[PDB]
């Protein structure tokens, strides 16, 4: 993922990008969505706006990190792509990592609205006019937000250990799955059990 040279944003907040293969983690969530160019910077702790306040809120003590690469060749078609919506009205802000898909018509005023648009009563959602002929910052941006965690349960998912070639009949410093020391490695005429 890191040395892909095909991404735009790979900022990692809680942990170092190069220490990912070292730390061992319990469970890994992975969120995904598509947003505008000028709103990728809003996917960060302590940010505000119409897409971070009540569309996708990241906790301040965030530990995973955010990946976002421009794709103006799959989600943008002539005449626009009206399959990508976003909420811009809500009663109140979002606590971190919350999902809201209800489509109750938002009421800005004190007037009862009764499920139909009217004066000071807006529809909650809004679409993206994803035109292929748009400047950068209005083009779609696919986003993935990895989010690591440390649970009291034992760690299950983490990176590959880099093995090396074995050497026989010399004095070296061995290490196999945790056991470590020094000595001479040689074949032995013994029998073990598969466990």
């Amino acid at each position, epitope marked *: 993922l890191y040395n892909s040279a095909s991404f735009s944003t790979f900022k990692c907040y809680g942990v170092s990008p190069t220490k990912l293969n070292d730390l061992c983690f319990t469970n890994v969530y992975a969120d995904s969505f598509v947003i505008r160019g000028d709103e990728v910077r809003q996917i960060a702790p302590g940010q505000t706006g119409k897409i971070a306040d009540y569309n996708y809120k990241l906790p301040d003590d965030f530990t995973g990190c955010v990946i976002a690469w421009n794709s103006n060749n799959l989600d943008s078609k*002539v*005449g626009g792509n*009206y*399959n990508y*919506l976003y909420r811009l009205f809500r009663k109140s802000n979002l606590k971190p990592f919350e999902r809201d898909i209800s*489509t109750e*018509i938002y009421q800005a005023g004190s007037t009862p609205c009764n*499920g*139909v*648009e*009217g*004066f*000071n*009563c*807006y*529809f909650p*959602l*809004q*679409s993206y*006019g994803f*035109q292929p*002929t748009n400047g950068v910052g209005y083009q779609p941006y696919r986003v993935v937000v990895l989010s690591f965690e440390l649970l009291h349960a034992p760690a299950t998912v983490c990176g590959p250990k880099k093995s090396t070639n074995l050497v026989k009949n010399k004095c070296v410093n061995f290490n196999f799955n945790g056991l470590t020391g020094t000595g001479v490695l040689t074949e032995s005429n013994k029998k073990f059990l598969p466990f």
Partner: antibody
Amino acid sequence: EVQLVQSGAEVKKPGSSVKVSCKASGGTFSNYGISWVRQAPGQGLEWMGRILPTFGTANSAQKFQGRVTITADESTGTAYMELRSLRSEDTAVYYCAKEGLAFLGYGMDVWGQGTTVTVSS
Amino acid sequence: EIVLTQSPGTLSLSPGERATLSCRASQSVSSYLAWYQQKPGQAPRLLIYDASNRATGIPARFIGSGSGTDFTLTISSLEPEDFAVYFCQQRSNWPLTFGGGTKVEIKR
């Protein structure tokens, strides 16, 4: 390049009913949002009401309440603008136009072609 | 119910000059205003949305500005296909009322 094919001219009589259809050329509907605009002969435009096809929501302007009824048929991708109790001054050219699934913002980017409706006796 | 008002009524000019159309509102609309162009016997088409954004395919000679309760659409290089009636619609809240019109004529 979404196209909005519309109906043809319909001469009618006062007190009758009319049903103007705005079919989306290209198949079915999407998150469009469709609003109905009429223009009196040799005058300015007027906005009557809008419909949300896929989300099922529609009502007309405060002046036109109780008279206009906008419905959608997602199976074929066709919107209806049934207008009852036609009055002598309700003769105009009726348009349909997609305006983005919203209430404020973008605007009417693709228009139909006009359905001249003459209401006389 | 916000009421718009365009001025002047006809605004006659000559080819190659500059136009100036005003759409002062009745209440405050933040930045939501669309400008439509209607040639005779045709369907209106969108030119400027959000009071400063040019729609796709529109020539660059159309520029919009203003905010609050006084907007302005300005045409730099008038051409024969720029003489029509120009409408402004306030897309703020219910209902989305239109404006009067400005039949940009030709001088001789």
